[PDB]
Amino acid sequence: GSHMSNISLIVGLGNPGSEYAQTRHNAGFWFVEQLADKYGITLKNDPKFHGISGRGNIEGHDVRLLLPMTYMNRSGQSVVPFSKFYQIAPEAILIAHDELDMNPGVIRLKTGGGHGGHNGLRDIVPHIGPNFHRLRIGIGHPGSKERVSGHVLGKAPSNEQSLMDGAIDHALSKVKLLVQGQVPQAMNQINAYKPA
């Protein structure tokens, strides 16, 4: 199983398929694929958990990575059975996701709280509760509530993509603190990020 608030499962939320790969709603996928490449964690086909997953060493800690392949609004049909099978408590889980409530280039580490209207988190919190950690990757808001779909399934303009990419790069450099259980310090150092 997991051990205390040493992060040992890192989830990236998004949609499968080339047509969704570059959309804001895949910010979580961008973070976990970049983290997998940084630490040489293989992301392989995991049909038993309806996802793509990996396991490897991050800074001396055994860590699993998961990209649900369920579509966003069914993410819990991967995350929940995965976390149960491996006996990973929510307190040892980080979920990286796009955050409509924050600007491109803003990134925050949050413990607990609601789904904030996120259709991926909304499929997860009912089953494992809220007490997992979140890497909230700012994607901006579109204005109106029907305009939301068009925004999260949009490919960001290059300036917004640069801002998100810089924030994601910053968060990659702080994963060492997270897998070491230094959540307070990782929160201080991630939340302080400025693009410029």
Q: Is 119 annotated as a binding residue?
A: yes
Q: What are the backbone angles phi and psi of residue 52, rounded to the nearest 5°?
A: -115, 130
> Is residue 72 near Cl ion by the rule CB under 5 A?
yes
- DSSP string computed for 49-67: GTEEEEEEEETTEEEEEEE
Q: Which stretch binds Na ion (CB under 5 A): 5-13, 69-77, 129-137, 184-192?
A: 69-77
Helix (H, G, I), strand (E, B) or coil at 28: helix
Please confirm, yes or no, whether 25 is among the known catalytic residues: yes
- Of 3, 25, 61, 133, catalytic: 25
Residue sitting closest to Na ion (CB): 73
The answer to the question of residue 71 lying near Na ion (CB under 5 A) is yes
Q: Where are the beta strands (DSSP E) in the chain?
A: 9-12, 44-46, 51-58, 61-68, 93-99, 107-111, 133-138
* Residue span binding Na ion (CB under 5 A) among the ranges 20-28, 47-55, 72-80, 152-160: 72-80
Task: State the Cα angle at 57 between 96 and 45, rounded to 5°.
Answer: 60
Burial of 127 (0-12, 13-18, 19+ CB in 10 A): middle
Verify binding: residue 27, Cl ion, rule CB under 5 A: no
Of Cl ion, Na ion, none, which one does residue 107 interact with (CB within 5 to 8 Å by kind)? none
Judged by CB under 5 A, which of 73, 173, 188, 191 binds Na ion? Answer: 73
The pair of structure tokens assigned to 124 is: 């997860």
Residue 173 binds: one of Cl ion, Na ion, none (C-beta under 5 to 8 A by kind) = none
Task: Report the residue from 36, 58, 65, 72 that binds Na ion according to the rule CB under 5 A.
Answer: 72
Query: Any known ligand binding at 188?
Result: no
- The annotated binding site is made up of 20, 71, 73, 119
- The annotated binding site for cytidine is made up of 73, 119
What is the set of active-site residues?
25
The contact set with Na ion (CB under 5 A) reads 71-73
The contact set with Cl ion (CB under 5 A) reads 72
